[PDB]
A and B are shown apart, each in its own frame.
Chain A
Amino acid sequence: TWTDDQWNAIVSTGQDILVAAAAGSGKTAVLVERMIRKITAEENPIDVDRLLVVTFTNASAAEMKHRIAEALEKELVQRPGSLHIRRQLSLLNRASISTLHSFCLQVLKKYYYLIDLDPGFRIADQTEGELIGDEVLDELFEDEYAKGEKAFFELVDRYTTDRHDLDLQFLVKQVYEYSRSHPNPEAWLESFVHLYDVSEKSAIEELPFYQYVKEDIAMVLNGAKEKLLRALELTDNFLDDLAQIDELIQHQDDFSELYKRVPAVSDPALLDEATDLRNGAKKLLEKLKTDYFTRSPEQHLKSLAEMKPVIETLVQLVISYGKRFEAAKQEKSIIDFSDLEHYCLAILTAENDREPSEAARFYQEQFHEVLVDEYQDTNLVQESILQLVTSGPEETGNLFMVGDVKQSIYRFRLAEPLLFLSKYKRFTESGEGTGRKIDLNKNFRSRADILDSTNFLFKQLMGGKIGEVDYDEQAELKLGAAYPDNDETETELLLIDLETVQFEAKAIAKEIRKLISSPFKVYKKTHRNIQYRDIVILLRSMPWAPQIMEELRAQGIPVYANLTSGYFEAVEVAVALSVLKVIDNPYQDIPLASVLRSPIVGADENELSLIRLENKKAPYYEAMKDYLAAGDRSDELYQKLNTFYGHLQKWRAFSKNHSVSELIWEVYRDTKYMDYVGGMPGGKQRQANLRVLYDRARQYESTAFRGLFRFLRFIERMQERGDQEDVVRLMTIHSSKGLEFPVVFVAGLGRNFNMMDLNKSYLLDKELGFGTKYIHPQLRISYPTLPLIAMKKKMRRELLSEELRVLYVALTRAKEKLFLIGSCKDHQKQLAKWQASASQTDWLLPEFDRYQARTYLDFIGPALARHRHADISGHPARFAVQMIHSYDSERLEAIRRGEPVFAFDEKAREQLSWTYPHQEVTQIRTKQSVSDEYSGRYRRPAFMMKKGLTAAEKGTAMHTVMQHIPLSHVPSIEEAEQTVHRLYEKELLTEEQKDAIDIEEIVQFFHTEIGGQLIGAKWKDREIPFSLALPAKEIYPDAHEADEPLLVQGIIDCLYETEDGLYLLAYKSDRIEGGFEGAAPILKKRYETQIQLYTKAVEQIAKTKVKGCALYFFDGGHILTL
């Protein structure tokens, strides 16, 4: 069965539809069914290729195809005579179901000729692409420096830390990369200046950015008052303060007014707690003052208008970068992932003087409906592409989108959830003359205590400017699980107070072992004890990942976490590269030493220093050689070196003829480093690391780069800048996604969010554009500009929204049990901070206090306190709080040298001593020609070479003639020429070959005895191809064991038959006269072997016998018999 909401999503039609699918909505199943119907229905079915389905991964798309396939089979078994249904089953491979990028690719491939794009274009990975950006940038900056334009230097002096210019070039990238999130980058770039065009005559309450200044003041002022009022309830001077505040609240609108007021005017438990509340006012007001009111509205304006010249320079720079970048790609026929979307949009839009091009029209025609998953993460470029392949205005049309704003956690990649949210508020629950929207509340996959705990917290947290979304019914999760009633399913909070992570990791570790030793049986299925793989620890970031893993594996099950970097500081990688470095250039003291001391060689410290002694001044490399040369053979350290120096020179030569990836593998199998690395702790991850280096070398050969040197720098770049077992899985909340677990630990909840983004001298924003500090290089003075401050306030409450959703996916990824684990300093006090916040009724916490939040605790804590004022504390959510004070053999030693002392003792012995019986024939060529790529046996350019022929080419020419000469009778010098000319006409002879033929030497043969005999005969044939199977030995004596037959193939020049028997004939252009009496013996032995094979072939295959064989020689016209 379905819910009415699912049923709606499945059957609705006639307009755009937005499906808000909560966690575990079963959206996939519903998405499948909807397509299944339109494709398999009695009324009037449609083919699959008429649908467009975009997903966020090729795996989920592939997943889509499988589930579509099954249902088709099922639908088929019932209608076994369905021609349409069977056909659809064949269309799934031709259907468009993929990531939007995957679609864009198909578009570019098809309509490439409309834009400027080389078919067979290549997609560069985000790495080489950036490395190209660095290059074009350096060229750009160099050109500007040389051009010496005034404006340029003003921009540089201003934004780069003098003493180096590095800082300017990532601002350029940062800006560029941002612009690409816009359907029209350039325009959006030129949009920057419009903000900085202002006068002292301008109204600040008007312009765009002040919106966030307005709302900021509103909060703080109100937050002040609301923070004071309680001090009054605590029960004088708070009325002076208060009255003054009210006076400010009256003028919240007038900014110029605030500049006049704000700057100028401004029990021992509850007694000393009421004083800090009054300080809250001070602190909040002081900040309010410093931010906006330390300078006049007029001076703020002047400060702004002054930076306009700079902003223009900056923009024109980024634009020049964009052009150069694109041009650089074109040269190498490549594109980025941004290009993929933008070129597609370019194809889809053909504007003259904005039009949905005829390419667009095709896709609008082709797709009857378009389905987009994870829509909350869509950007502007994608959306404009979507709106373009979708046919019809919003009221009607075939756009069908599904997702959940509450689960939008990717804004740092510039995804726009407001796009989804704007449509949700624009759409009605019905379909009347607008986009139809549907909600999926039921969570079929999670237990009640989960949904209740999650619904409980985010009801007091998500909302207004922090949540960006009102948390209400039709939004709240609803129970659809059939879970049996059981306890210890309660959500737990473990509060604890470098070692921070240690005390944090153990608390986690503990309850885990509680779970394992204790029953706790996970779940018409049946209960299951904890397999360690059903439990997971989710972190926001991965600085603690390594530390956690350690002690969690210190006792019991090990830990698996998907590590990203720290890869270049990995010992193996270091050593491996070190080896490649020495192979490239042996003259590097550090890289060489790093190898010699590594397990690969294993030199001692005394051995290393011993080496240097030989030569102190010279580089270490030859200090090693100098040790070798004069060294004594019986020396151990000498061995180690000599062996290594042997490999080095082998590797040196090897890379010369081979690729980098190949050399790497060779080094791995020569040193057995990868094998060795598998024998030390964590050797599994180490081996992986060692073989991704090989993979990256593979990815590197397909790039615009080549050679070992470039590869090294390539890796050097990555360094400098970017970089079925049952175990506890440690992973980021961001990587959690559609994944799901019985038990979920979310730790680090007591750690600050990353606000580092809002600090620097500049900020990039979608709406507002570019913002920066006022900076004067001559006066050496700088300070935040008004827009800058405005962009921060906005960005902070948007960044905070993101975190509340990140925390929302964390809790929803659980099916049965939850662990919330935070950390702080002083227990009680924070709970008092929380008490202060948790007073206000209405559920949803104070919009300002949520704002002040820094750490996840600041969200949970206060929302948790009020729980355990009617429904809030009676809410069917359960919790368990823990206040933690934070403080509370022979075989190896045999292996160390020799062997120990089995069931397989006998088999292991023979398999290692085994041999391939037919081995010695495995390297021998099957076919072997005698004169097709399947057989075996200093040229100068024709334009620089002579005019004539070579002895070989002449011979071939002479040969051809003899084989085409009519054997009817004895030809004359003339009749021979006629043949030579006929060949020439028919093109069996090149103009040269013709002129190179000596007719006499050809006619001569037919005057010899053999000639006359050839003429007069019962039967004759020439150019006779043959293949003769022989025992391998018969040719190759060397190998003696295997007697498998090989094919010897050749052509018998001539065979003729007389009343005597069968005779053989061969013409040879060998040079003789320069008598022939002495040449005969030599010639005889030259073709001695060949001729026997000929007769062999005839005698064995034809089962007749060859009596005598003649050879003719054009030089002198001789003959000899064998």
Chain B
Amino acid sequence: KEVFADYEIPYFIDGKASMLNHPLIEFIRSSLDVLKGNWRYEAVFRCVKTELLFPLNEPKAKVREQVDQLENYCIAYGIKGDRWTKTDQEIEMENMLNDTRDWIVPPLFQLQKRMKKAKTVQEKAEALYRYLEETDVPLKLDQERQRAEDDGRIIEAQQHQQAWDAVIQLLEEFVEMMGDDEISLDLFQQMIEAGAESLTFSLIPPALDQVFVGNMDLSRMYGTSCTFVLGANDGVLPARPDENGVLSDDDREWLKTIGVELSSGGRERLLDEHFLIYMAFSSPSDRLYVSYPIADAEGKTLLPSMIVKRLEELFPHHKERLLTNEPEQVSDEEQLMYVVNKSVAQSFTASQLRLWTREYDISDVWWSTYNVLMSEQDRLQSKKLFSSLFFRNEVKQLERSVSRQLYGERIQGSVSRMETFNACPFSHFASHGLHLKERQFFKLEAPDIGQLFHSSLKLISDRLRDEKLDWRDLTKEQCELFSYDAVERLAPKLQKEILLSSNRHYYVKEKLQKIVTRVSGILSEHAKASGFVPIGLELGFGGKGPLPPLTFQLKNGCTMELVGRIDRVDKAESSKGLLLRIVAYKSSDKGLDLAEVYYGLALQMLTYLDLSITHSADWLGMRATPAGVLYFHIHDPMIQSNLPLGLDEIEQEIFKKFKMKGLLLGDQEVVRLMDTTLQEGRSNIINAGLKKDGSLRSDSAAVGEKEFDLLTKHVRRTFQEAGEQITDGRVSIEPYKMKNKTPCTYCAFKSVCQFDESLEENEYRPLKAEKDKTILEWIKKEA
């Protein structure tokens, strides 16, 4: 049908068409599914989308959209089962959501009342019927019948209320045979289900002039000139004996000897296949074509049947033609048989021009075809189609009149928003420019887990202070209690109460609890050693909050008020004066790679540090020097040792693994303020050590205050050069690969950017893995 539709060949098919794709058949099936699987939203919208439940007289256009929006909702909120049966922006939305379900639930709901109550068949078959009439299926059907006609499709319009009878006769026969027989949906539905599969459409009546496409068995023909035979494949043409029915080929063959004749069926058919292919081969008066495909629908190999071989025996010197969608594989003659229609001519010419640029010498028939299509009225389209010849995925720079009004007066920057840009300018445009949002689901994603920890930790503080208590004053007994209660208060209010949705999630609950309990104990141990005392916590930076946003002025009327959060800022007094460091809770392992920092991929810590330092003066009336930046790893560990350990040593190994990673200051005291337990050797709280002489180890992640004030400046210039390019309207596409990794990992916008390496002009901008020092001196050289 598809092929001939394109090639404009009129035809007639013997077989009939299933009704399983018809709205009426679907609507019915999905409906029973709705009340069996207990209102799985998938099934509910499966019914609503046959739009037989649609409100009367209300414009479809809207209705659909409302239905779709409701679908999104049910998906993100995991609405199912009883949930159905149970100021400017939200009113519009929430009420539309209550209106939509208001015309959906009642009909489908009332039905289940009827069904479950009804015992016998007739009353169940009937409860179903009403469900159709009360929803005015006939009316809406008839309406749809029209639209089909007005669009030139009568055949389709005929199948509508033709489908109506099929379902009824099914019910009639049902209530006829087993009407007064008791039964419930389980089997009742099964029989309806088998009824639908059997439903058929009236055979499409023959037309005066048609190609006759039919089978090789009982199909009949007369006065046929040319006959094509399809599927001459082995295992197909001389059809392998079909294994079906209650009686085996053996049984039947036996019965024969008892003076009982049945239908052939087994081995006799295989004898009769030759007679049937005989009639087929002798069917045409003028021409006979016998064809077979080499490959499979999926690609598996297919051989010709024994028939082709014997044909080659009666006609040994007969050549056999080739059927291919690759015209270049045939002579100019055959290539002229592809120009049968505008559409197909185009589809082929486009592919010819392609393969041509590839240095292959093509046939001039396609040049003719080209010029012809180039001289018409729909030239425009063909032109489009042929633009494919040279299609490099191109990003036209934004303009000033757009970037301005789009991005806005002030570019209210985020450290994350800047990282996303320098990660790939296009991703920025999609997220902050076009404001594209993914479809929300009821799955608890990895990130949102983090937001839990924070608020839990933040919550623990509040109660500690309220009991005038501190982490170090905590006990292993208390750590547990305090932690658990925290998640109690939180859990229900997290991610559409998914933690309360199913059982696996309420186990994930105490799972998250046991983690916090550990982290709570680790912090205690970190407080009893650390000489650093927290100053500000969850420091509001930018916008409305404790600190002023940091601003950026650059040429071209640029304004950048960037806002952000500060997990934790800690102070410690030394002989060198005030010391400030920053800590940020983290799920994964490693915190800071200077290599990432150079390209502006990780600016989080370094930017946070500056403010604390800079504003220190004014803020707390004293000048601070950077102690460093730290990442705390939140998790419940699994140590792996070949050495047998006692509970004593186990707590040690568990403790060591929370060893913070980051960037430090390279002097003896700063280390000792961070770990006061450390005299000599390595520290288990921080990544640093001490030789006997008092100097620290080369393994230490520490650096001079110079290097710190080096990076900080680098982060500035990044916000500047990357801050202007935005205002310049740069939306280009340039993913990076470093080190051997890419930004396209989970990137959602991949389908929009449509990045293709093979296609030239689209490249991965490489970044090189660098010894911390190797990017260090690079920065030094910049200014």
Contacts and interface: CB of A to CB of B under 8 A. Distances in A.
A1048 to B, nearest CB: 13
Contacts of B22: 657
B737 to A, nearest CB: 8
A163 B364 contact: no
B396 A590 contact: no
Interface in B634-656: 635-645, 647, 650, 654
Given A69-B306, A612-B434, A606 B347 contact: no
A161 to B, nearest CB: 9
Contact of A911 (B329, B340, B751): B340
A684 B433 CA distance: 35
B243 interface: yes
B320 interface: no
Contacts of A338: none
Contacts of A313: none
Contact of B388 (A156, A679, A918): A679
A780 B207 contact: no
A1079 interface: no
B389 A892 contact: yes
Contact of A163 (B347, B353, B355, B449): B449
Nearest to B357: A892
A903 B758 contact: no
Interface in B130-157: 138, 156
Interface in B157-177: 161, 164-165, 168, 171-172, 175
A128 to B, nearest CB: 15
Interface stretch (B97-105, B508-516, B526-534, B716-724): B508-516
A163 B640 contact: no
Contacts of B506: 145
Q: Which of A590, A699, A783 has the most CB of B within 10 A?
A: A590
Given A617-B89, A780-B636, A922 B402 contact: no
Contacts of B644: 294-295, 299
Contact of B406 (A612, A892, A1042): A612
A681 B354 contact: yes
B781 interface: no
Contact of B371 (A294, A616, A899, A944): A899
Given A165-B504, A589-B436, A710-B42, A606 B396 contact: yes
Given A656-B50, A1046-B208, A941 B434 contact: no
B308 to A, nearest CB: 10
Interface string A96-132: 0000000000100110000000010000000000000
Contacts of B235: 58, 62
Given A142-B502, A901-B371, A1046-B208, A780 B243 contact: no
Contact of B203 (A587, A906, A934): A934
A162 B511 contact: yes
A606 B398 contact: yes
Interface in B396-432: 396-399, 402-403, 405-406, 429-430
Contacts of A657: 21-23, 156
A656 B25 CA distance: 12
Interface in B1-25: 2, 6, 8, 10, 20-23
A925 B241 contact: no
Given A902-B364, A923-B10, A782 B640 contact: yes
Contacts of A247: none
A329 interface: no
A939 B141 CA distance: 13
Interface in B91-142: 122, 125-126, 129, 138
Interface in A612-628: 612-613, 616-617, 619-622
A70 to B, nearest CB: 8
Contacts of B754: 571, 574-575, 594, 597-598
Interface stretch (B62-70, B487-495, B679-687): B62-70
A272 interface: no
B710 to A, nearest CB: 31
A927 B206 contact: yes
Interface stretch (A670-678, A746-754, A1104-1112): A670-678
A680 B754 CA distance: 14
A951 B618 CA distance: 99
Interface string B16-58: 0000111100100000000000000010011001110000000
Contacts, number: 376
B87 interface: no
B208 A926 contact: yes
B391 A680 contact: yes
B369 interface: yes
Interface string B339-359: 111110111001101110110
B205 A925 contact: yes
Contact of B435 (A66, A616, A783): A616
A617 B406 CA distance: 12
Given A585-B72, A658-B21, A941-B172, A908 B372 contact: yes
Contacts of B205: 925-927, 933-936
Interface stretch (B294-302, B567-575, B576-584): B294-302
A669 B350 contact: no
A717 to B, nearest CB: 14
A interface bracket (residues with beta carbon within 8 Å of B): 35 or more
A779 B647 contact: yes
Interface string A883-908: 00000000010011111111111111
B224 to A, nearest CB: 16
B770 interface: no
Given A59-B303, A162-B515, A610-B402, A586 B389 contact: no
A591 interface: yes
Contacts of B77: none
Contacts of B208: 921-922, 924-926, 1032, 1042, 1044, 1046
A924 B206 CA distance: 8
A542 interface: no
B440 to A, nearest CB: 11
A767 B353 CA distance: 60
A657 B749 CA distance: 32
A707 interface: yes
Interface string A290-312: 10001100010000000000000
Nearest to A69: B306
A90 to B, nearest CB: 7
A141 interface: yes
A58 B390 CA distance: 43
B399 A606 contact: yes
A800 B283 CA distance: 61
B637 to A, nearest CB: 6
B231 interface: no
Contact of B206 (A145, A706, A934, A943): A934
Contact of B72 (A587, A784, A912): A587
A411 to B, nearest CB: 24
Contact of A605 (B385, B396, B502, B635): B396
B335 to A, nearest CB: 9
A659 B21 contact: yes
Q: Which of B122, B342, B372, B759 has the most CB of A within 10 A?
A: B372
B368 A707 contact: no
Contacts of A938: 138, 161, 164
Interface in B733-783: 740, 748-752, 754-756, 758-759
A173 interface: no
Contacts of B50: 656
Given A94-B240, A656-B49, 12 more contacts: A163-B511, A550-B758, A574-B754, A585-B68, A597-B752, A781-B640, A903-B364, A904-B369, A922-B208, A938-B138, A944-B129, A1044-B209
- What 6 A-B pairs come out closest when comparing CB atoms? A679-B388, A899-B374, A145-B503, A294-B642, A908-B368, A589-B436
15 contacts: A62-B234, A142-B504, A145-B507, A586-B68, A590-B437, A593-B434, A605-B395, A606-B399, A609-B434, A616-B435, A678-B354, A683-B388, A899-B370, A902-B371, A921-B209
